[PDB]
Design a protein around this ligand. Structure first.
Ligand SMILES: CC[C@H]1CCCC(=C(c2ccc(O)cc2)c2ccc(O)cc2)C1
Ligand SMILES: CC[C@H]1CCCC(=C(c2ccc(O)cc2)c2ccc(O)cc2)C1
Lengths: 235, 9, 233, 10
């Protein structure tokens, strides 16, 4: 693999160039919205983001080295996690608000509000740490590779994922050392970043519950792709 | 399977 | 000011090791559980007793007692199944393909193959156990990870932040003490913390099943277990 | 109210 041959700077450059764009929603301030229609907007937005995410994943160093079935599994496991850390990243500069889209900035106003507050808290954590763009793309790639690494010779695939994950770890430290952090500060910041991933996992799990609670209630037309991504978490 | 299709492309 | 931050690394390790709860036994009777009633019966009884030890363990975790009572409640409600699971995974390290809920309660996936929607969580725990085993996870490292789970999982803040940093220093200290290079240290630190995301995932899937177990009528839940469960819903 | 509130005192 060429992913294991990349320097930390090359790794960063690769991830930065693979970044998906920020998409617009169908939000219209002159148009009235219910909770049902607002979920419709987000569903539509997430569906279009998924297509970009899939092509982003293919440009994550080491990802296409895997079998298609393993590629499918990782994305099935991580898609809402990746959407959420993207949402949180976009919302850093907007305290108390979530920037779902450049034209969709929502503040806190069922347990949907709880998930909302959880996202706000994570965003608050990002800005207090002064999370960098180079760090963010590393974090996002880690989520993709790690979230499903533990759901014959399938172990060879699992080994490769671990080695790439080690590479991203090396890359994170490299970025922090370049930022002038002491060794103690590097280890502490590394831990801080990775602990956030546990929180992102939690929000994703809670998010899937609500989306499944949604789907069953007719309430909102889920897209064909979202239905399949969602169904993977039901088994 | 949609995801498998888009990945295989 | 908390005395947790004033502790040396070795003192932090000693405090956590001393705070360790015991490994409890399940009820005897050598009947291998192959029913959803019997096995959930055994697991509920064990977890209920383990919870009481966990609560008193948490109070001996440096920094924890410095929090308000409500913050202590919040963290325990958020993390209790995670804490139970990482303990289970740790106990099962030396028994590949098996989960050691207790020294006299050793289950394999074929018993998990009962009970609707548990074999998946079973497999996840087995994978985590194997991972800890292949990493040669040490007891001193384990108690640091378990304390991190307690303090982090419901953290959403500055006191907890510094204590979490202190435990990070303690983990690094242990790895350096074990003779690891700087690169091996931060690589191992990353590997251990990434597993915590999987533990979180397994806990959330576990809550769903426990809630599912509750909604039916199979095992009487203790009032304590019912309140811990309700906190997640 | 909560059992946990009592147990954390003892
Ligand atoms: C259900 C919890 C909620 C929390 C954050 C906002 C959410 C979604 C989301 C998250 C990030 C994002 O960029 C776009 C959309 C979402 C909404 C509907 C859907 O069918 C899929 C995803 C989900
Ligand atoms: C298949 C393993 C997993 C599935 C269901 C949830 C589990 C646990 C459980 C079961 C019943 C219960 O009321 C509270 C907790 C458990 C976890 C760790 C431990 O030391 C004891 C019990 C075990």
């Amino acid at each position: 693999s060429l992913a294991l041959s990349l320097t930390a700077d090359q790794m960063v450059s690769a991830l930065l160039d693979a970044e998906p764009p920020i998409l617009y929603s169908e939000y219209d301030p002159t148009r009235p919205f219910s909770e049902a229609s607002m979920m419709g907007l987000l569903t539509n937005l997430a569906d279009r983001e998924l297509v970009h995410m899939i092509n982003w994943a293919k440009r994550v160093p080491g990802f296409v080295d895997l079998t298609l079935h393993d590629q499918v599994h990782l994305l099935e496991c991580a898609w809402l996690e990746i959407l959420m850390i993207g949402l949180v990243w976009r919302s850093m500069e907007h305290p108390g608000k979530l920037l779902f889209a450049p034209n969709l900035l929502l503040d806190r106003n069922e347990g949907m509000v709880e998930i909302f507050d959880m996202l706000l808290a994570t965003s608050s954590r990002f800005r207090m740490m002064n999370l960098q763009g180079e760090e963010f793309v590393c974090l996002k790639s880690i989520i993709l590779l790690n979230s499903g690494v533990y759901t014959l010779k399938s172990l060879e695939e699992k080994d490769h994922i671990h080695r790439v994950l080690d590479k991203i770890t090396d890359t994170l430290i490299h970025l922090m050392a370049k930022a002038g952090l002491t060794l103690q500060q590097q280890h502490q910041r590394l831990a801080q970043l990775l602990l956030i991933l546990s929180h992102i996992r939690h929000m994703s799990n809670k998010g899937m519950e609500h989306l499944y609670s949604m789907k069953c209630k007719n309430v909102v037309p889920l897209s064909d792709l979202l239905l399949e991504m969602l169904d993977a978490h039901r088994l | 399977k949609i995801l498998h299709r888009l990945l295989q492309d």
